[PDB]
Amino acid sequence: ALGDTLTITLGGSGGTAKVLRKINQDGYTSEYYLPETSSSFRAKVRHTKESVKPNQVQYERHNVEFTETVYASGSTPEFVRQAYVVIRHKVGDVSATVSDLGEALSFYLNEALYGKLIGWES
Amino acid sequence: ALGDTLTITLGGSGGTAKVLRKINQDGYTSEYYLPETSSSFRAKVRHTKESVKPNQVQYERHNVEFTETVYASGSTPEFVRQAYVVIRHKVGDVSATVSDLGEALSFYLNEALYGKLIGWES
Amino acid sequence: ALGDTLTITLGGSGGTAKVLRKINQDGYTSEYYLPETSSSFRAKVRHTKESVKPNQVQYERHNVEFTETVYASGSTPEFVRQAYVVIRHKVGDVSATVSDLGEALSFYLNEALYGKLIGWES
Amino acid sequence: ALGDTLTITLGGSGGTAKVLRKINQDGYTSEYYLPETSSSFRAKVRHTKESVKPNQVQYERHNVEFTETVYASGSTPEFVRQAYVVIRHKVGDVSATVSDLGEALSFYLNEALYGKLIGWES
Amino acid sequence: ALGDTLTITLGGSGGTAKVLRKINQDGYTSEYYLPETSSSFRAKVRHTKESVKPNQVQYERHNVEFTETVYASGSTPEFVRQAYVVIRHKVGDVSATVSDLGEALSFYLNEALYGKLIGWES
Amino acid sequence: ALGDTLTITLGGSGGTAKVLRKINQDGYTSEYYLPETSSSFRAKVRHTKESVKPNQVQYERHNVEFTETVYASGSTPEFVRQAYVVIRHKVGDVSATVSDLGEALSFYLNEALYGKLIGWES
Ligand SMILES: [Ca+2]
Ligand SMILES: [Ca+2]
Ligand SMILES: [Ca+2]
Ligand SMILES: [Ca+2]
Ligand SMILES: [Ca+2]
Ligand SMILES: [Ca+2]
Ligand SMILES: [Ca+2]
Ligand SMILES: [Ca+2]
Ligand SMILES: [Ca+2]
């Protein structure tokens, strides 16, 4: 129950806000979508357990995903851009400590690191 | 390159800083390590390319993850925490748009979003 | 979106108004309902997209459905009345032109023409 | 027996009227067609029963569809635009109600609705 | 289409307020959730139609269910506490009468009566 | 040990009073009855142990139901109305918090909630 719209601000805090709408909601998941003249945006949210095992620990998994598709033009076919995050932690763990992670990762990644990553600079 | 030491600031800005070190670099990927008495920190950065197929678009993938492990104490067994992201785009795509999408995804996620997401809100 | 309530004005403009309520949402579909002592109202909205084929044009379908149900009384058994529309167009098409075609189809249909169509003359 | 020409006013009551001509009349069915420099129009009208089998109500069907095609230009291949309505009701039913329903549906659909469906809102 | 949040006031009117959130609603049902340090709240709403058997009346079930669970602390293991209501009526009945019966049931229940029932006096 | 007469006020507070009479009580169960010219009223109360599972918590249930019957009149056959609630919790628990949960459930249901719930809203 995050809201009726999801706002995507391309270029970080730069600007160019996009406001997606629910399209679907099933199985603790959500669909967001919005089309434009030359492309479209899609947002996805999921939650899930892992299969129970006799004596190993039980975990829960979360992820969020963004996707953009650009329609074919000229002789160039159709292609998409994607970007998503995942979090995995044990059942019953402390919320604040797991929240420290993920947030640390988000603070880590910024424009320069994204540029370096694009350059295969491991 | 990307640096010899990586800093993880648990809790985002103004938090506690942990510094890792290079250990290995094989198979287009590199990993970082830091040991401690009660737990440890590890990081990996990897790049990969999907196989060529006679007629479809060719894509590149970037993945970055954080892992934290807690050693068993008393009755409590081993357990772990992770959090990672992936970026996927076509080989010839302009880098700036991919960077902008990644910056948007980074900006969206923050403490309130992580709390709600742990709350199983979809 | 589309609102929580859906209004049917039986008999076109200036007629009798019925107000259905949403009661479900699954599989990219929505359903509306209303109880009556002698009948019942349904309303359904469905969306669909065809899968990808090697070299073909990809299409999507939009459907809107109205149904009337009358409970069996005396000798007369159960029977229903129904009326629905469908829209189909390609993934990257321009919305405005499809909308204009839909407006044309809606404007062509009217009371006298329905009375003619029930007359079996092609 | 609708007439020797069928008129389609693109954009609803706005303007841009097209005039098709009958091409055929076979088996309770009719066709209309009109060629142009870069596109064509076509309309069809059909009526049918259903297969009978023991102790059920017997039903009727009226179908009307609009079809629009655009010829290949440059790299972009051919594609079509379609929009059609179907009416179903029982033999011997009262005509005025079957028209009041159906004309209510015609009144419901307009610019805003078609925009919503193209937006995938349900 | 109840709403985006549910309010539970423990101890009847004038008590402590608790706010639940959407997590899911697929099969005409709904489910709510909220976590706490030592407990969690869950609320679920269901609709169902009883099995059809020829030449007999048709009925409808509506169910509303509250659950509260407390996490184990030492020797004491998990244990749970729920209270739920059910309403059954025939299809096509009058809403007002069923509502009045339910209101009478609700008005009969109160502080003293729950104390008596938990006192086991038949 | 409730008493000799149970009062049902159809329509909640300020409604029409109906006084029932005790008829029987054998197995920790009690029921009340009243006949009428066109209907009939009945109430019941039950208590029971849940089955004992080796090395798990032990639970007990309190149940109460209202039933309303309308005799066949001409074409219309027999039909009935009901409304009942159930309480479950473990042995040795504190009665007052359980009363509080029942109080919350009872306070939630009222005019509007019943009106919307009978409309199949979920
Ligand atoms: Ca930028
Ligand atoms: Ca924090
Ligand atoms: Ca190496
Ligand atoms: Ca009319
Ligand atoms: Ca227009
Ligand atoms: Ca002919
Ligand atoms: Ca109290
Ligand atoms: Ca759903
Ligand atoms: Ca009332």
Author numbering:
A (entry chain JR), B (entry chain JW), C (entry chain JQ), D (entry chain JL), E (entry chain JS), F (entry chain GO): 1 to 122
Text of the article:
Caulobacter crescentus Tad (tight adherence) pili, part of the type IV pili family, are crucial for mechanosensing, surface adherence, bacteriophage (phage) adsorption, and cell-cycle regulation. Unlike other type IV pilins, Tad pilins lack the typical globular β sheet domain responsible for pilus assembly and phage binding. Furthermore, C. crescentus Tad pili are proposed as a phage receptor and indispensable for the infection of a single-stranded RNA (ssRNA) phage, ΦCb5 (14, 15). ΦCb5 carries a 3762-nt RNA genome encoding essential proteins, including a maturation protein (Mat), a coat protein (Coat), the β subunit of an RNA-dependent RNA replicase (Rep), and a lysis protein (Lys), with the gene lys embedded in the reading frame of the rep gene. In this study, we use single-particle cryo–electron microscopy (cryo-EM) to determine the molecular structure of the C. crescentus Tad pilus and comprehensively examine the molecular basis for the interaction between Tad pili and ΦCb5.
With our cryo-EM map of the ΦCb5 at a resolution of 2.7 Å, we reveal insights into the RNA packaging within the mature ΦCb5 virion and the arrangement of the Mat responsible for interacting with Tad pili. The ΦCb5 virion showcases a near-icosahedral spherical Coat shell of 89 Coat dimers with a diameter of around 290 Å, while a single Mat extends 30 Å beyond the shell. The gRNA adopts a defined conformation, presenting stem-loops to interact with the inner surface of the capsid. The Mat of ΦCb5 measures 135 Å long and 30 Å wide. It comprises a structural framework featuring a large β sheet including β strands β1 to β8, β10, and β11 and designated as the β region, as well as an α helix bundle, encompassing α helices α3 to α8 and designated as the α region. Positioned at a twofold axis of the capsid, the β region protrudes outward, while the α region penetrates deep into the capsid to bind the gRNA. In addition, we find that the N terminus of the Mat is exposed externally on the capsid, affording flexibility for potential protein tagging and engineering at this site. The gRNA density is overall gray except for the last 111 nucleotides (colored differently, including the last stem-loop of the replicase RNA gene and the 3′ untranslated region, or 3′UTR), which forms a four-way junction domain and interacts with the Mat. Stem-loop U1, the final RNA helix within the gRNA genome, engages in extensive interactions with the inner surface of Mat β region with its tip sandwiched between Mat and Coat dimer 2.
